[PDB]
Design a protein around this ligand. Sequence first.
Ligand SMILES: CCCCCCCCCCCCCCCC(=O)O
Ligand SMILES: CCCCCCCCCCCCCCCC(=O)O
Lengths: 278, 278, 56, 281, 281, 255
Amino acid sequence: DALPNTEASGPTHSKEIPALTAVETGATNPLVPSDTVQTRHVVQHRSRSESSIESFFARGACVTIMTVDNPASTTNKDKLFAVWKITYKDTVQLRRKLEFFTYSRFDMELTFVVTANFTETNNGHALNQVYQIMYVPPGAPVPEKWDDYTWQTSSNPSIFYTYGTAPARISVPYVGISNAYSHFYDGFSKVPLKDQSAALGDSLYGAASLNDFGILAVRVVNDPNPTKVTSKIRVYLKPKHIRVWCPRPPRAVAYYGPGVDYKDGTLTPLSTKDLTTY
Amino acid sequence: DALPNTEASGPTHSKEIPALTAVETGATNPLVPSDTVQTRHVVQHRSRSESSIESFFARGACVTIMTVDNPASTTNKDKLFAVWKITYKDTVQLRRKLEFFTYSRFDMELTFVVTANFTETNNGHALNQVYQIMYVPPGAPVPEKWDDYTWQTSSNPSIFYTYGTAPARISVPYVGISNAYSHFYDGFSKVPLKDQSAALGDSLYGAASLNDFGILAVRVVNDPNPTKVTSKIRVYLKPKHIRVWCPRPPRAVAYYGPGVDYKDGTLTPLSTKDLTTY
Amino acid sequence: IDDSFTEGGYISVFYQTRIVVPLSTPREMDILGFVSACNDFSVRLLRDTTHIEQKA
Amino acid sequence: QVSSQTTINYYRDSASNAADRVLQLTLGNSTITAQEAANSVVAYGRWPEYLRDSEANPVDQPTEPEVAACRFYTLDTVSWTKESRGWWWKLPDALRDMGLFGQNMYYHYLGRSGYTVHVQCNASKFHQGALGVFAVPEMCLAGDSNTTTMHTSYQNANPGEKGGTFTGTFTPDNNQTSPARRFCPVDYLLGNGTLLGNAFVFPHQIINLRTNNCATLVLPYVNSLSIDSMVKHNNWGIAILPLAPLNFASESSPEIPITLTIAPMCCEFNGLRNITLPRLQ
Amino acid sequence: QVSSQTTINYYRDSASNAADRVLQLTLGNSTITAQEAANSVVAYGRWPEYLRDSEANPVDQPTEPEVAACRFYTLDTVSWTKESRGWWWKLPDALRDMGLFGQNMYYHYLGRSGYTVHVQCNASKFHQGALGVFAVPEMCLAGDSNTTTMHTSYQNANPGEKGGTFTGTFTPDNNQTSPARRFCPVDYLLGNGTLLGNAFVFPHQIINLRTNNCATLVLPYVNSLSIDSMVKHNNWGIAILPLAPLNFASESSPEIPITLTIAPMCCEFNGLRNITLPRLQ
Amino acid sequence: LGNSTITAQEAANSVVAYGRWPEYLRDSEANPVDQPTEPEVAACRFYTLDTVSWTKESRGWWWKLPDALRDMGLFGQNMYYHYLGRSGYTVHVQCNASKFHQGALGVFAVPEMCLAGDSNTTTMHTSYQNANPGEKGGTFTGTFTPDNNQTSPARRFCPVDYLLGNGTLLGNAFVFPHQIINLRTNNCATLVLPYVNSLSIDSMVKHNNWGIAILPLAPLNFASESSPEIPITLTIAPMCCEFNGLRNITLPRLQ
Ligand SMILES: CCCCCCCCCCCCCCCC(=O)O
Ligand SMILES: CCCCCCCCCCCCCCCC(=O)O
């Protein structure tokens, strides 16, 4: 869209005094440059398209790193499959971009980038591996062994990624039970009633099952080789069709956990600067 | 386009004397072969399409070579990720082709060609590597470690290239803050004021932030193997939709740095040839 | 980015006529600033921010 | 579909697609007047409205108290001494022991409501100061323990009408045996960890003692859910912070009182049952 | 779209798509006459024009001096001895201490302007020589130090009206303690490092003493920016090089003087403030 | 005016001296032929001259125009470079005091403002340097004092305050365009002075068309305090200023 044209202006002697206002009310001054300065006509070409919500969020961001290994059958140590609870609060950048706003409805697009590497000094051979990435919604059984029944994916959607091909990718609609994702929640999930044990009803502040999306379990389908092979799946999350509500002030101090807590020594964001110094 | 047809001509005895002109003015003589010679009619088929600006620039040219290694975890030496400041003045051929003209608006198309090779005599095994190529605009934090927060690419666009697949490629619009890229800039970024310290206001000649496009950081996503693996990303730059302004004379002596300087011993471009010798 | 070529300029506040307070009145005022964009503002070329770091 | 600068959708599911001084207001049997109030802020430009069936989740017939609950309740008064950093009251947790609104919200399971908050603080022409009243939505606050997160208790996170206060400097709850589980919001960080200066993004007004002595905020019902439990979730939150400290006639002990008058508007309830008797002390 | 020798665009963003002797001219209160001037060169065939709002970046009302600054200023005169290699004056840096134009460009932050350069040099029918006047846009020049690049100082790169000179042979500034930071442009390389012969691509004229004694160049405002600082960026640059050496009656000491008369045209300014007082010596 | 803006919430309207807004020279009454250089925005700005303390025992001040705007921005440069120049002015006198202050100023825009000399042994003997103080302005003296020095006369103005300098009376001085800054009512005074002169255009370095005289009609007083001071500022904006006759720049002797 073509932003408003900067209309011309000239000397004035009126008493409207648009320059002076009162900030006590909650309305910002709509004053424009033409009002307080002699302004020349200017055809306007600049557009705010790049700064829209989509263009501001139309970029995948890493949200986790999941480590899965394929220990050699020589060593009795069991395989390590990675169970990562779905959330965007593991990192900061995506979390900080989202926590500008209070509520958000956005379809999601997840991309999995896998990498592998040998660990034992023995430069052995490992055939191309196949990774299973299974989504376990809230309630579905959590796999406990890399080769148990739960991996059948009878109802849990799953992706089989052949290492070395294009990174895996899948889209998901808005899955919130509420009508918008709650970035912040001031409240509890239980109310401690006056006539029950203290332990009962004790729930973490600002913790609710609105952000309860289940887990994501990643395993190496290949049965173990003679040489251990480690791998690290990276999940990049892109919000599509995103709508946001109730803006907020961006975080200033480093995050501390899922909540809005801040650590003791992190409360010094600003920098030294003398009052009268350009 | 069909160039002008070479019209016929015959003996003439007039006094227009188009052959003689005066070079003192700044207008070249539009004389044509028919004027000074008996010329036969010739239907013209030749066209100047191949020589247009697009066809002259419609070819990617290498602009840098970035070295990134994956040192073995056995050796404590840290990984080497490559930070290359975006510019076409690392090479000569593309620089020389562009420096025909003074200003240029061109969309860009960057292609990354990656190669790898083992270094240690030990012929070990290294699983297929994944390279991250992240664009850090002017101001965004510069990654200092291969595994720090800045690699999350929350807002910085990034490409994940799986070594062995088709070379990476991406297009970019005209990103100049001005209305055309300034190949040459006669001036400074600061004016040394008469009432301040000499150091303040001291800026390099012909250096301005018009060509300030940020850096490009390339890393090997894979955590280190037991065997070091080096790699070299090559960036090939193709100008698309290019328009150029204010032609200039092509460089004659070898370049020296970003400026228009020339080295002491390079000032002998031409070659020996006797005046009267075919 | 703080840049020499694309500088923005300078802004300053001075006393044109000193603050005059009657007697039995506080003799130390305070002024609060506010900065916003006008309706013709715009930005482009999204990038990352240096204000937040995921320590380790 | 050839869009301007060929867009073909191949997947059935949609997620797979590509990207002024004078004021007098009457609520029920309550009336509020203010001759030097600098207009009102309709937070987010949305007046409170009754739930519309087009976006109605529950089925049960809603009980709207109307006059009996949409009244102006004056919460306790607080002294704005020179060395005071601020105060914060969460809503509707403040109106939990106020008239019939408290009874309705405890009896009914689900409840929604907008509010009209009138902050009153008056000083002479010779006084010097300025308050900022922000209606923070989903107002969270940081805990006091660096060894745990989201550990605050229900009793301490819901002070009631007494409200809370902002502390000048952070102080960890070093007690590892019986943690206080108590909010410790730093004044300039606003508690959430953001900066105070940016806090003006929230709906807000400023009570500048030279110009105005009142601040009116009409807060609609904002929530991810059309209707939600009032005993668990505190939708809004009022934070009053003094932008410029109080001063008066070179006197080092000036006090003036600040009062709040909150009126639920278009409050609706559903899900009647035994009355909630929560543990608060 | 089936184009002649199927072009379908799949990406929304556009970057993703595929590929004569007599002359008399009056400016303000100044008039120039020349009975043997060989016409004029409108560099790039564009007459200077005032900024058009369709391509106007700043908003501030522009101050156009008009008559007070669009005058012909005669810069100092220079002797064209036999063993002289050339001269170069950067614009508008030359007109920095010339009348009100200097004051306007120092006071105002941004400024654009075209120029009309009249180079005057007259010799008898018995004199023999030829000058070439080139209006180099964005005229850069090579430094004197091979140990550093772009190291020239503001004072040395902006001689003023005195202008500069081309040196016959390059000479490195071997002083490593206090580098002179001074231009050392070789005459035949034109300074930029290119060749003199090709320098005719630039707008140019030739003052051939047998034919004409004057050269007029109407230089428009060429720049990546519609309006730009005049104290930092020198848009154009005049370079006068003798293509054929002066000679006269077998005399080994012939001198004739060359004068420049530059007239800003359609000069506009914006951004008034305290006056720039740069360090130049 | 141009890039300058002036605001005043308690200014008691403006005086268009003689009811004539400044206008560009009309060819119907144009003496010279040369194309006129009108700076427009670059010179029709509000320049704030220095500030002056209105102590209790202060008699007045006077600034001659355009001699005041001789070292102010580009207007000074234009008037020194160009031979002939005409211009109107907009003078804004600013002086603010509390509700507890007591006083009143009178600002008169005296046309062709002459002032009496200091020597009774000679007439019209004032020097150019002393008769054109610049932006510093001048002051009115309570009592006349002859310049008795007969060897090197000071050639300096000695205008008595109540006589207004010209020799007339202060009371009648209200015939001139004027305003009153009464600290109880208003804290500003705006005067739009047109270009009045026997000539359509005249030299600006020789002839000072107008002259601003600020005299305190009632002395300053505050809370029975015998040392009350408040500052008075002037902000002058040339309007419709035109020039002719460009040449070498005048470099006059002023000190
Ligand atoms: C692993 C293969 C199948 C994966 C199926 C999709 C996985 C994501 C489903 C839940 C996403 C909802 C939470 C994302 C948005 C948020 O938390 O803000
Ligand atoms: C590495 C993956 C993302 C890369 C994003 C595009 C990188 C290029 C963006 C800046 C290009 C501007 C400069 C090119 C033209 C020039 O310098 O003449």
